């Protein structure tokens with residue numbers, strides 16, 4: 380049992396980790412809180428037991444991505460990883476161990492625990508998120524997260540935001556072409572819908588006859604929805620109406636005076652055509668000018684959430 | 686749950702001198718908790734100093750205090766202790782005891798709830 384794994388001591392290189400708690404249940408791979416008996420340092424440990432080579436190469440690519448993104452203040456710090464051959468495993472299930480730094484918890488958790496959020500709070504939250512994405516798009520080749528939601532935003536022990544789950548990421552861009560046959564468009568949409576959830580789908584992955592590019596601009600749409608959620612406490616496409624996503628039909632609260640400064644960014648990130656959406660660099664620049672004109676350091680720890 | 690931690694034993698101490706901190710616990714199971722001492726150094730913030738396993742099988746310290754400090758515990762009385770020796774001016778701070786350990790670069794998991802005890806390493 381994945382729950383009876385608590386109390387076990389896992390050896391990972393020089394580390395001898397005691398499994399203390401269950402942090403998350405993903406069905407395929409639990410996430411545990413682990414503590415080294417030789418140093419006392421605590422970690423988060425992801426453990427995959429699977430034979431399916433699709434999940435295996437997924438977590439292998441997941442590891443390589445984190446090593447590339449290591450050292451960034453807004454991305455969760457990679458520690459170590461190891462895999463055990465199916466032949467040599469204890470249960471005869473191929474074992475993969477993924478170890479990263481331990482955070483305080485999910486942003487969502489520390490959100491509902493605390494009237495509404497001030498503009499300075501939303502500014503720090505969103506800016507530190509966009510810095511993480513910016514660092515991913517800066518790589519060679521660029522890294523596209525594709526699974527950007529508030530559930531994947533963590534709050535560090537320092538009080539800053541850390542982006543965490545990179546299992547869905549990719550470095551391949553897809554450009555629907557004249558040479559794309561009618562059934563190729565059909566097969567691709569199936570593959571996307573089986574790996575996605577309605578409310579998080581983008582216009583470019585719903586209509587595959589629009590010839591919209593499917594790449595980096597996906598994240599900007601996701602960031603656009605995040606900023607909306609941070610302000611108005613709801614997803615702009617929560618109900619999952621695919622008719623409203625493709626047509627970009629959402630509604631900013633009519634008489635909202637509190638988050639007026641963010642209306643320009645929301646409208647500019649939620650553009651149906653990816654080629655009309657702001658780049659990640661343009662997003663950061665506008666945020667920095669908002670922070671400068673509000674006398675706020677956007678990289679500073681968010682004490683309100685602590 | 687209610688967590689009640691209370692530190693004491695600090696005060697004005699001289700460089701190269703010694704001191705002995707203590708902490709009482711209640712409202713949780715002290716026998717099922719990795720216990721740590723953390724300090725709040727002025728101009729630096731919070732940092733992890735020392736830690737001990739729930740069964741005292743392992744004791745951990747930060748590099749700047751190894752060999753000089755000694756942590757211990759008594760589960761029967763729910764008491765945590767820190768024996769400090771060869772105190773340097775850098776050891777000056779506000780000391781707390783917390784549950785669980787740390788992450789990354791000596792950054793504590795649990796951010797103090799108690800008032801803590803003051804430790805001042807001064808040459809009078």
Ligand SMILES: COc1cc2ncnc(Nc3ccc(F)c(Cl)c3)c2cc1OCCCN1CCOCC1
Nearest residue numbers: 402403410423424425480481482483484485543544
């Ligand atoms: C103490 O709180 C956490 C610290 C964490 N520190 C680091 N990483 C986390 N998640 C995570 C995410 C993806 C990964 F690949 C790995 Cl290795 C770890 C963490 C998740 C944590 O909590 C998980 C949140 C899932 N909760 C579980 C309870 O119900 C609401 C959903």
Ligand SMILES: COc1cc2ncnc(Nc3ccc(F)c(Cl)c3)c2cc1OCCCN1CCOCC1
Nearest residue numbers: 433434437525526546547553567571574575584593
């Ligand atoms: C939220 O997750 C996704 C979003 C996606 N969003 C857009 N496109 C995807 N794939 C894709 C693949 C081929 C194509 F030609 C095109 Cl156009 C798109 C996506 C794939 C996604 O998941 C791919 C598989 C990720 N899992 C992670 C762990 O389990 C095994 C692999």
